[PDB]
Structure formats: C-alpha cells, structure tokens
C-alpha cells in the first residue's frame, strides 16, 4: 500500500483511541485554534471596543475580571459583518482593541463543531451503527449558530453576537428580551418545553429504570455492580416499570416499548431545542414575540393593563438603558 | 482589586479537603487485595 492509502487507513481507522476521520481532519486544528485563542484571550486580552464608540469593555482575568464577569468580548460595531482576521489589522494591538479574538474563536469553533457533527456521522458509519446521533447533536449546534452567526447577520454586526462569557451571556439575553420580547415568542416557549420537558423526562426515565433494577447484589455493596458491561440480559424489569408508571397515570399514557420510549426521549428535547434555535434565528430578522401592549381597552377607551403590559414596562427599562452612549437617534433599529 | 482576603484560603480548603478525602479512599481501594 502507498503512503496516501496508509494515511487514509489510519485517519479512518476504527482502532484509534479517539476517532480522527475526515471530518476530524478539519475539526482538530480548528477546535485547537479556537481553544488556544479563547484561553489566552480570556486570561490576558485587553479591553475591547464592542460597540464601536471608543468605550472599551474589559473581558479578561488579568484586566479586572473574575470567572463570572469575564468574557471574550464581541468585535467592534465599526467592523459590522466585515471579515476581520489578524492580517487585516495594522498590528496585534489594533487587532485586540477591535475584538479580533472573538471572530477568530467563533469562526474556528463553528467550523469545528460542524465537523464534530459530521464526525459523529462518520464513526457511526465505521462501527456499523445507525446514523442519527448527529441529528440529535444538530440541535445544540443550531443554537450555537443562532447566537454566534445568524443573529449577527440579521442585525448587521458581530458586535451583537453572544459574548464568550457568563455575564456576557446574561447581557445578550436581557438585550434580546428588550428588543424581541422573546419570552412571548412561541418558539422560545417550545424551547422551554424542550428543556423543562427534557429535564422531567430525564429524571423520570432515570428513576423508573433505577426503580426496577433486578436484585443482583447485597445491601453492603452498590447496586451498580449488579450490572456487568456487555451482558446480554437487560438490567431492569421494564414490565414492572411500566406497571408502575401506567398505574401512576393510566395504562395507555405509559410506554411498553423501550424503542418507542427512547425515541420519545430523543425527540422531545431535540425538537424543542430546534425551535429555540429557530426562534433566535428568526428574531434575527426581527419577527418578534407576541405584542399585546394596550390590547385590552374599556368602554371609554382607557387602557386596561394586563401582565403583558407589565412585561412591556420591564422591557422598556432594558431598552432605554442598554448601550447607553451608542444611540443618537430615537429608534433603535438594529 | 479589593477582593475578600479570606477568598484564597476559602477556595484552597474548599478544593483540597474533599479532593484529599477522595484520593485517600481511592488509594486505599487500589491497595486492597486483587
């Protein structure tokens, strides 16, 4: 076998401790670059003029931040959606002032995570598995795209992409509520049904299976030792589990089919989160949450507030305070 | 920055005490007759 053939065989080998593969060939350097730049920046990057008004915001640890406040700060509003790689700056100092690290990191990462999805397909293929774990992964991925790429495209600037930091994330969420009323958006509501529901179903499955474990151990040892890796027998009694759950609610509200059940467990949070992603991705083009501001009116025409109007007041506080020196004209249009 | 001066010893013991607990249990498990 020639060198290229050997190399292909290695890359796609099922025996590597961590699978490489062709998606891996792109994934590994891009993820490494994004990771290294992210760590260095998070520790040591100088303040970044996120909103392009010469008002640099400090994100790194060495420059006054802790873990909760720190961030890799989004690139300058002056840049908008322009491609700002290192070689477009006159110097690393300019590059840093303008938030270059953010673009390097989020582009390398979006590419790398995409290739992560693909790689999940690839290994499933090499191992003779069914292919759709990558489809489940597409939901968190879609979300990442929504907040790092799509929302910036729609708003015309990577300066409005989600910051790489904990407090930065909260900042993103609050400004988002101010301008899109995302809480009142049915796709976000489906996303909440997705993760609340995912949590519920996680606890439920976990507890039903744990509740029906077949006795294989003594009271002085962990029950986990009653399962052995690769045993062909199932480790819990699903008939007993279904008897329980079916009696908890009623019989036909419960799954007797493990395949159907696990498919449910995959489908609910994945679809919900798909809708979360699409919610962000469409509010990216300012199709916003429901607006029932002043929707109820009495016989004279007096406004009768509902809880929606209280929400509106909170949003107003957020709106008027956010980026307090960045607007010169009355409408915040992006 | 004017951080809390006990913060360091707090974080240090918070990490070290339970980590050390676990390391003790692990090592004495390994050394038990195989």
């Amino acid at each position: 076998a020639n060198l290229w053939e050997r190399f292909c065989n290695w890359v796609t080998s099922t025996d590597n401790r961590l699978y490489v593969g062709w998606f891996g060939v792109i994934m590994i350097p891009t993820l490494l670059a994004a990771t290294i730049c992210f760590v260095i920046a998070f520790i040591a990057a100088p303040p970044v003029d996120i909103d392009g008004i010469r008002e640099p915001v400090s994100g790194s640890l060495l420059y006054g931040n802790n873990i909760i406040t720190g961030a890799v700060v989004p690139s300058s509003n002056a840049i908008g959606l322009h491609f700002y790689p290192i070689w477009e700056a006159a110097s690393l100092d300019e590059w840093l002032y303008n938030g270059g690290p953010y673009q390097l990191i989020i582009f390398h990462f979006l590419l790398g995570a995409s290739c992560y999805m693909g790689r999940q397909w690839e290994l499933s293929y090499r191992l003779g598995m069914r292919p759709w774990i990558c489809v489940a992964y597409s939901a968190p991925l879609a979300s990442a795209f929504a907040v790092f790429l799509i929302y910036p495209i729609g708003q015309g600037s990577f300066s409005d992409g989600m910051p790489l930091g904990i407090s930065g994330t909260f900042n993103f969420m609050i400004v988002f509520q101010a301008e899109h009323n995302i809480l009142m958006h049915p796709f976000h509501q489906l996303g909440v049904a997705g993760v609340f529901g995912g949590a519920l179903f996680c606890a439920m499955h976990g507890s039903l299976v744990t509740s029906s474990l077949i006795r294989e151990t003594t009271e002085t040892e962990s029950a986990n030792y009653g399962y052995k890796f690769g045993q062909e027998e199932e480790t819990y009694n699903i008939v007993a589990a279904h008897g329980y759950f079916g009696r908890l609610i009623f019989q036909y509200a419960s799954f007797n089919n493990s395949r159907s059940l696990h498919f449910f467990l995959a489908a609910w949070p994945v679809v919900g989160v798909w809708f979360a992603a699409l919610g962000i991705s469409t509010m990216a083009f300012n199709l916003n949450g429901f607006n029932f501001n002043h929707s109820v009116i009495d016989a004279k025409g007096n406004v009768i507030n509902t809880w929606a109007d209280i929400i509106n007041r909170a949003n107003l506080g957020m709106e008027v305070m956010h980026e307090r020196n960045a607007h010169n004209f009355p409408l915040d249009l992006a | 920055m004017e951080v809390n001066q006990l913060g360091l010893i707090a974080t240090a013991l918070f990490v070290l005490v339970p980590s050390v607990f676990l390391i003790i249990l692990y090592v004495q498990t390994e050394s038990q007759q195989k």
């Binding site: 060495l62 890796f229 045993q231 | 951080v3 360091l8 974080t11 990490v15």
Partner: peptide, 30 residues
C-alpha cells in the same frame, strides 16, 4: 492571587480531562 486561583483550578480540570480519558479504568466485557 485571584487570577492565579482561577487559572489554577481550570488547569487542574484540564489535567483531569486527560487522566479521565487516557488513564480511565478500561471497560471490560463479561
């Protein structure tokens, strides 16, 4: 000291990733 603490904990976590992965107890079929 704060920065040193944060980075130190992070570094320990990364080392932990390394041992958890390459020095895990190998799964064995029965």
């Amino acid at each position: 000291m704060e920065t040193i603490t944060y980075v130190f904990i992070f570094a320990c976590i990364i080392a932990l990733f390394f041992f958890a992965i390459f020095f895990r107890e190998p799964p064995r079929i029965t």
